[PDB]
Design a protein around this ligand. Sequence first.
Ligand SMILES: Nc1ncnc2c1ncn2[C@@H]1O[C@H](COP(=O)(O)OP(=O)(O)OP(O)(O)=S)[C@@H](O)[C@H]1O
Ligand SMILES: Nc1ncnc2c1ncn2[C@@H]1O[C@H](COP(=O)(O)OP(=O)(O)OP(O)(O)=S)[C@@H](O)[C@H]1O
Ligand SMILES: [Mg+2]
Ligand SMILES: [Mg+2]
Lengths: 444, 456
Amino acid sequence: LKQKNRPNRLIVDEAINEDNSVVSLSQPKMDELQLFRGDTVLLKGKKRREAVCIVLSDDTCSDEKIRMNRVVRNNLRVRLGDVISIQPCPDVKYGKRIHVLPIDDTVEGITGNLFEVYLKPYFLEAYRPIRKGDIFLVHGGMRAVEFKVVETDPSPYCIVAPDTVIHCEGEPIKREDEEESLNEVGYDDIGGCRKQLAQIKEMVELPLRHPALFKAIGVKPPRGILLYGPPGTGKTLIARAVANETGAFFFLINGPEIMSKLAGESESNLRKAFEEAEKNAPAIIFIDELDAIAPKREKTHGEVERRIVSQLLTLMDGLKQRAHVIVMAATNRPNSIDPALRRFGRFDREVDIGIPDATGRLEILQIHTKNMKLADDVDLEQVANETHGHVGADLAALCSEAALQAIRKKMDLIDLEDETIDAEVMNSLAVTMDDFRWALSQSN
Amino acid sequence: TAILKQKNRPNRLIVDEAINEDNSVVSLSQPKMDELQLFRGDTVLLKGKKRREAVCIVLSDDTCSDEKIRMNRVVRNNLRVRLGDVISIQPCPDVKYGKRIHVLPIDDTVEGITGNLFEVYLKPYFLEAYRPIRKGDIFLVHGGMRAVEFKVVETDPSPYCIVAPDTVIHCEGEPIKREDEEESLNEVGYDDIGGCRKQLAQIKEMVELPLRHPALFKAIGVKPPRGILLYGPPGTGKTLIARAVANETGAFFFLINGPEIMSKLAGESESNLRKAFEEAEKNAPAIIFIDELDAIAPKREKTHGEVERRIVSQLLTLMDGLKQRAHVIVMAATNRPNSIDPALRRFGRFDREVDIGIPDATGRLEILQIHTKNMKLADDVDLEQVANETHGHVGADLAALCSEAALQAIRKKMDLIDLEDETIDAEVMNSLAVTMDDFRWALSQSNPSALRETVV
Ligand SMILES: Nc1ncnc2c1ncn2[C@@H]1O[C@H](COP(=O)(O)OP(=O)(O)OP(O)(O)=S)[C@@H](O)[C@H]1O
Ligand SMILES: Nc1ncnc2c1ncn2[C@@H]1O[C@H](COP(=O)(O)OP(=O)(O)OP(O)(O)=S)[C@@H](O)[C@H]1O
Ligand SMILES: [Mg+2]
Ligand SMILES: [Mg+2]
C-alpha cells in the first residue's frame, strides 16, 4: 500500500507573497479536473487536515504541482514536496456567523480593536473561504496578530460575506496549546515500522473505508488486531498516529485507566466505549496495554478483575458482523493475556512492533531531531550505526540527553535566578556530535 | 446412528423453478393437488429452512412433476431454500382479510429520487390482487423505471393475512438496512454445520425429539435425559451448533453466555441465571443453552472467590429445580470438560455428552463448501484438494484459511486500489476472484502447515 498516482494528487510548491485564500494550478491541470477560475476547492493534507481555497490558473506552475503559501501549508500540515489532494467544493454557503480567537503571544500589550484594526480590513469585500481550525496571520497598523477559526455556521466551512457576523470575543488561545496540536502525531512520526504500518492500513483502515471490496470477494475481515513487542517500540505512538490519521471514529481505551476505576465502574466504562464506537461506526477501538485489563484468568486474585476480563470477552463477541468496528490493542506482555481473547473472531491477528534495524533507527533519529537545533557536524547515520539494540524510546532519550548536555555546557553563562536567559546564549544553542557522543557513552 | 434422515411424505416437494412467476403463486401438478385435497386458488402454507414460512396461492400445472413445486426466486428467498431443496406444503384456510399492514423499503433500493412509494409501487402491486403476505416477507416491486424491495414488518391479523381493498398499507418509517437483512438471510442453520452429521443426529434425538414428541417417551415409559454437554477443542463449531439450534428449533430458546454472566455484579450473576431458567420454564417446551459452561461452573476447588462458588451452587440448584414436567432441556458447551465441577455431571444433570471433535477429510470438504458458498471462486479452485491438505484443521482453522485466501486476492489488487479513493474501480470489483494460487499461498501461510503434524 504505497501512494498511488491520481489526477487530483499534486506536489506542494511554493507561492511567496500569495494570499491565504488562493492556490495556483497549471491551466491543463484545471482543464483535466474540470476546475474554472474562481472555483472554491477543498484541499486535503496530512492528519485529516483540510483547507478551503480559491483556485487560479498559473502558467509558471507545473501540471503535477500546486502553489500555496506558508499559511495554507501550515493548515494542511504539509511541507514543500508533500502530496495533497484537490477537489471541487461547490456546496460552500455564505457564513451566518464565525468565531475567531487571537493567539496570546501576538496580542501581548496594547490592542486597540481586533475586529476594526485587523479582521474587518482582512475580510472586507473579499468573500474569503475559511474552515474551522484554520490559523491565519493579519497585518493591522504596525503589528501582526494570528487568529484561529474556532467555529463557523455553516460548519465546518463557509464564505465570509459582508453579512457574516465575525466574533472575536473570548480568552485568547494559548500558543502552547496550538503547538501541541500542530505537532500531533502522524504516520510520518513513526520510523522503522514501514511494514507494520502497511499491515495496519490493510487490516484496519481498508475494511473500514472500503467494505464493498470485502463483500464483493465474499470475505469477512478480521476484527481484532493485537500489536505486540517490547517496551518503547512505538505501540502507543502508532495508536496516536492512527487516532489522528484515520477517517473513522476513534475511541481509545487505556488499560491502567479502566483498572483505576471503582468496582462496577471499570465494566461500565468498557461497555460505554464499545457502545460509543458502534453508534459512531465506522469506528476503531484501541485498547492500549490490554494485559492490564485482560490477564490470564489464573493470574487473577480478585473477583472484580476476573469480572472485567469476562466483560471484555462479552463485548468482543457482542460486536455483530455488521457493526463496522475494528478493535486494535497493544501489549508488551502478549503471553500474559487470557488465551480466550486470542481465539477466532476476537484478537486473531497480530502485528509485531519489534526492534528496529540500522535504517529504521536512522528514521527514528531524523523524526526526533527534526525540531531540534543541530550543528553541521552531527552525523545521524553514524549515530544510527552505534545504537544497536536501541528501540524508539531509547533513541528519543538519547536525543534528549544530547540536547540537555548542550544546555549543561552553558550553565556557566546561565544564572537560574535570572528573569531572562541571555539572548546570544539562546540564539547560539545547538547540539553537537560531541554532545551525541557523550550521550552515546552515557548509557543503557 | 445418523438414522433421523428426512422422510418421504406426500406434502414434501422438491423446489423447482418458475421464471417470471408472480410472488403470490406456487404451482403443483394436478394429481398432487388431488392427493393433498388442494383446489385452484386455495391459500397454502409453505415451510422451508430456519423456521421460515410463506403463504401463497396454489395453481395446477401440467408441466410440473408430481413430486415438485414451482416457485419464483422471491418465494425461495423467503423460505430460505434453493432449487433442489425440500419444502412442506399444507392448506391454509384460516387466513383473514388484513386490517392493516406495515412494510418498509430496503435502503439501497430507495437511494435518491423517490416520488410516492405507496402510489407508484405498493398500490399497483396490491391493487385488487388479494395477495397473501407474511410478516418477514421480502418482495420486489417495479414502479415506473425503477425497482424497490420491501419488507413486511407487521400484519394485523399477525403473522399473515390477505391484502384486501380495505387493508390499510403503511410504508412510513426509516428504511431497513440491506446489511441488517443480509445478516438475517445468512443466519446460521444446520446446513451451515459441516463434518458433524452424527453429532447433529445425537442432538436431534436427545433435544428436539423429546421436546417435539413427549408422548413417544411416555408411551414406552422413559424419562429422557435433560442435560446435554457438547465438548471438544477450540473452533470445532460448538457455538455454531448453538446458533443453528436457536434458529432451527420449534422450541423456545434461551442462550446463556458463560463470560456474560461472569461479567455481572455480585448477586446479578446468580439473578440472571435464575431469570434464564424461569423464562424457559414459563415458555416451555424450551431449550436453555449454556455456552462456555466452564466459565460459570469450574471445580469448586479451582475457585478463589466466594461469589464464584456461590454461582456454581446457583446453577446446580437450578438444574435440580427443573421438575420432571417442565419440558426443558439444558444444553451446554465447553472446550475444557475436565475442568467442570463433577457435581454438574451427575445423574439427572449434565449426564449425556456429545463429542464435537476434529473433522476428517470429507468433513473438512463440507466445511470448505459452506464457507466459500458466498465467496467468489475461480474455476481452478479444487476444494477437495484443499480438504486433503488441511489435516488437523478444525472448522475455525478452515474459515480463517478461506478468509486468508480471499484477503490475499484483495492484496493482489493493491496496485489498482488507492486507499484515499471514494469508490473502488468497477473492473477491479467485478473481476475479483479467489484463485487456487491464493489458496495455495494461504495453505503455506500457517497454523495450517504447523497443524497437519498434530492429529496423526
Ligand atoms: N518507531 C518509533 N518512531 C519514532 N519514535 C518512537 C518510536 N518508538 C518509540 N518512539 C519514541 O518513544 C516514545 C515512547 O514510545 P511508546 O509508543 O509510548 O512505546 P510503547 O511501544 O507503547 O511502549 P510500552 O509497551 O507502552 S512500555 C514515543 O512517544 C516516541 O517519542
Ligand atoms: N463444524 C463446522 N462447520 C462449519 N463451520 C465451522 C465448524 N466449526 C467451526 N466453524 C467456523 O468457525 C467459526 C468458529 O466456530 P465456533 O462454533 O465459535 O467454535 P467453538 O467450537 O464454539 O470454539 P470455542 O470452543 O468457543 S474457542 C464458526 O463461526 C464457523 O464459521
Ligand atoms: Mg505504550
Ligand atoms: Mg464457542
